[PDB]
Amino acid sequence: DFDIPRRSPQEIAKGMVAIPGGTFRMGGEDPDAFPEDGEGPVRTVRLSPFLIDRYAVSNRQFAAFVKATGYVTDAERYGWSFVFHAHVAPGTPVMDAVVPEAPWWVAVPGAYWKAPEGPGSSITDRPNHPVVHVSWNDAVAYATWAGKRLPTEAEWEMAARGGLDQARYPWGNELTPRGRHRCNIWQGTFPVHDTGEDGYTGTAPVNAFAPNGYGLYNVAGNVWEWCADWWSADWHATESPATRIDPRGPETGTARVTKGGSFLCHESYCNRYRVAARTCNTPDSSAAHTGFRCAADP
Amino acid sequence: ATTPLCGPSRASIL
Ligand SMILES: *C(O)c1ccccc1N
Ligand SMILES: [Ca+2]
């Protein structure tokens, strides 16, 4: 509904790192991987050079987009969004809706990006947190307004891997090297109690913890990140140029790829904060643990 | 017992 504003390369590039063109080994061979996630095979992928944000898009940055355009997010058009059960303050009205197999997810009317736990919450103390309750549609809109685009899954994974060849995490193979926490995921007993041992039992600021070798922050944990690709478990098992040179994912689908894991992920349940991990969500869905960062062409 | 679910979709509740 809004015209695309004129932006300079250096304005688009602010807050982004230049990933140089090259190959990298994409995917995972973890024996415990859920086969339905299609984390394999591991393959070599060549990519044209691209820019990617150091940070997930923040609340402050999303509010600017909303203020400049008047964009209405899918969660506002719908009237509700998904809030984790422990974060719904008592008294808040909730739908009786049950996400099958995930009763910890609550449909809260009036939960959206500026009120992430429902009516009566605010983001005044979370300006540098990742924006959440943004659908894939909302993300594309921001990106296009900003002169950017969502990363492909391969761009996302190349950048999140930080110049490491087939490490488990963005920083290496140890979850907590030297016993220090490196991302915001779950600790304790999911979904009953998060001990917050890494410092956060919700979103953390987008600059939390140390960056990976390419300078990216919180590619592991904090919030799931929308990518451009249609989801599939097996399109990328074919060996062809379409799947190994600047791959765009399948031409069609019903859900869009999400990468990186979030503050709810934990080894005992999903184990999806590994950098090869992947899942999806339908493109107008939104939840309290899902955001995005942008990519751009140089 | 099946596959863990991290992406909750609007369609899943219908
Ligand atoms: C079922 O197979 C299941 C349920 C919870 C966590 C992990 C797994 N594998
Ligand atoms: Ca945490």
Ligand SMILES: [Ca+2]
């Ligand atoms: Ca992430």
Ligand SMILES: [Cu+]
């Ligand atoms: Cu997860």
